[PDB]
Each structure stands twice: as C-alpha cells, then as structure tokens.
C-alpha cells in the first residue's frame, strides 16, 4: 500500500461506485465500497479524508433503497437536545476560516453605506446565529462622525437558546456604547417564516442580510416568492453571502464530480495550516463539511437543502425579483484582501464578479457576497 497513487485511485473509486448506485444494483456498488473503506481514513491524507466522507455519503444513499434497514438503524436517536456542540462548530468555522470574517466586514461596510444620514435603522438577520456580525455593526455605528442611530435588529433562528444567547451579548454591548438598541427575536424555521408579517415601524431604514441561507429555498417558485416578500418591505440594501459552486446538478454524477472539486479545496486549507491530529480540524470536517456532503449526495428532493449554485444564477434570480445591484466599494474590498493577508489565511484570494465579491482558494471559487438595492 503506497500513498500518492492511492489519491488518484480513490477518485476513480467514488465515480465507479456512484455509477452503480445511480444505475443498477448494489452488488457492484458494494465491491468499490469495501475497496474504498480500507483506503479512506478520517485522520489521514487530504484525499484520504475526502473519500472518508463521500464513501459514507454513498452508503446512506444505498440504504435508502431499503427503508426498513435505514429507519431501523436510525431508531434510537430521538432524545437529541444538543445545541452546545452546534454553536461550537459555528464558532470554529468562524475562527478557522475567513469566509464569515470577510462576509461580515463586507455586509457591515455595505450596510453602513446605505444607512448614511438615517436616524433609525432596522436590520433583519435570517439565521441569526452569530452575534459577532452585529458586534461589528454597533462599534462601527458609534465610530461614524454623525453618531449612533436608533437600532433595531430582528433575529431569525429555530432555537430559542441561541436567540436568548445573542440578545444578551448584544444588549450588554449596546448599553456600554450608549446606543439606543432593541433586539426583536423571532423563533421559526425559514420555510415557515412570513416576511410581510414582520413588524415595521415607519420612518425606519431597513436592511436585510442572508448569510448562506438563500439556497435552502431551491429545495422546496419557493425562491421567487421569498425574494419578492423581501422586496415587499422596500429594503435599502439586501446583502447576500452565498456559496459559489455548482452543487445542484440533476443527476448524481454531475452533482458528485463538481461537489468534490469544491470540497477538495476547502480540505486543502485545513491540511496546509492545521495539524492532522487536531480535534478542531476533525470537528469541522465531519460535523460541518461532511454533513453538507451527505445532503448533496445521500439526500434527494425536498430533504436535500444544500443546492448551492454559482454567482451568475443567483444574480439573474435576484434580478428577476426587481432588485438592483449595488457595486461593493473599492475600499471595502481592499480590507477583505487585508484580512486575507494576515492571520495565516495564506492562499486565499478574492476577485470581483460584476460588483460582487468572490472568495476563492488557489483560483477555485468558494463563496460569493453581493449587495443589492431595491428596484422601483
């Protein structure tokens, strides 16, 4: 058993295995799967890790051919009330990757721009799970020469614990900055959220922010209904941070090949700068990246929610809802390039696709941030 040749070999194994599941019986699928399992480790090479999570991904898809075994195997997992680990993974991604640090700086720089001269400010956060994005806002609002404005934030998440956690950290910081500030927590999933029902106090200025939360509507016109509902509030700006990869092919093959291209790039960052034995590395791959991969491969239909698409398809879709593009500023983009120079983050680079920011890793695009103005 010799290494780098196994790298190519593993790839061929995933394709050969996937073709049997997609077309025909598992007898030949089991062949490559056993062949894969001896060669893939969660703690080894980058391609060893990659094949560790795709192999289990295809197995789950095979299990769904027999609902009996799948349901029976997943029969003792109900008493699950663990959010403390869930927030731990969100903090790791925040710290170990600049994806969110760049997005947060970019949206707040974009939000500040549309809110010049506004005494009242309303921000809506879909999947408001990380407070540090707004911690930067309160700082910057107080930093501007005019002075802080009255600030309301609406937090959207499916867990009251996180919203209670965000309010506390947010309200305390506001009072210490002498900012009039109000947190309005709404507890609901994103499918069931009604945007129009949301309280709007007139005389306000509205801003909407969606961090990696738009593509879940492509599962369930579920998207176009939602964007128009945001349009119905007349937002000054809507900033959309979204993933920039074609992971929503119709077939398993087209979905698989492009999927591992992207996740291979993400796993490279982790090997380049993190020890292989660190639990933190293992906790993001298995619990964050590896969960995504399972949804892209094992799941299909409405229960498959990753559905990431490239920046172009998002631009058209957003445009169709009567949204105008706001080019991101030259000096907000300089700062993101400045974030990516320091704090390790070697190899990351950002480019501009038509007034929208694209974050890439060694010329492989990963995530896109775009600013949008409400047309008409």
């Amino acid at each position: 058993l010799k290494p780098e040749e196994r790298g190519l070999y593993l790839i061929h194994l995933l394709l050969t295995c996937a073709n049997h599941v997609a077309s025909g019986s598992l007898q030949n699928a089991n062949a490559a799967l056993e062949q894969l399992s001896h060669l893939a480790s969660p703690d080894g090479d980058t391609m060893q890790r990659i094949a560790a999570y795709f192999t289990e991904a295809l197995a789950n898809r095979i299990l769904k051919s027999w609902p009996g075994l799948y349901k029976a195997l997943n029969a003792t997992q109900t008493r699950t009330n663990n959010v403390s680990e869930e927030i731990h993974v969100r903090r790791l991604f925040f710290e170990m990757f600049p994806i969110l640090k760049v997005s947060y700086l970019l949206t707040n720089r974009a939000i500040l721009e549309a809110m010049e001269g506004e005494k009242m400010v309303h921000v809506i956060d879909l999947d408001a799970s990380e407070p540090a994005q707004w911690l930067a806002l309160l700082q910057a609002f107080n930093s501007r020469p005019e002075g802080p404005p009255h600030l309301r934030i609406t937090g959207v998440h499916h867990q009251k614990e996180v919203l209670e956690q965000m309010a506390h950290r947010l309200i305390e910081e506001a009072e210490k900055l002498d900012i009039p500030f109000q947190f309005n927590p709404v507890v609901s999933r994103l499918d069931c959220l009604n945007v129009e029902q949301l309280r709007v106090k007139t005389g306000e200025a509205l801003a909407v922010s969606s961090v990696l939360q738009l593509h879940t509507f492509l599962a369930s016109g579920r998207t176009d209904s939602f964007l128009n509902a945001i349009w119905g509030l007349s937002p000054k700006v809507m900033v959309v941070t979204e993933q920039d990869s074609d992971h929503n092919g119709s077939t398993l093959m087209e979905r698989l090949l492009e999927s591992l291209y992207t996740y291979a790039a993400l796993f490279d960052c982790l090997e380049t700068k993190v020890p292989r034995t660190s639990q933190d590395r293992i906790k993001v791959e298995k619990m964050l990246f590896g969960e995504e991969i399972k949804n892209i491969i094992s799941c299909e239909g409405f229960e498959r929610r990753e559905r990431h698409e490239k920046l172009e398809k998002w631009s058209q879709r957003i445009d169709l809802a009567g949204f105008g593009n706001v080019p991101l500023s030259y000096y907000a983009m300089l700062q993101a390039r400045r974030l990516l120079q320091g704090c390790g983050f070697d190899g990351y680079r950002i480019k501009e696709e038509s007034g929208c920011a694209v974050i890439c890793w060694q010329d492989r695009p990963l995530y896109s941030v775009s600013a949008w103005r409400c047309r008409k």
């Binding site: 790298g7 190519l8 790839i11 391609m47 291979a264 490279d268 090997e271 380049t272 060694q362």
Partner: peptide
C-alpha cells in the same frame, strides 16, 4: 502541498 486539488486535476484528464 502536493495539492489534493491537483490529484483530481490529473485524474480528470485521463
């Protein structure tokens, strides 16, 4: 490193 991203690059050409 010897890129894992490069590993698929050479295998996709084949």
């Amino acid at each position: 490193s010897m890129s894992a991203t490069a590993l698929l690059q050479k295998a996709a050409q084949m």
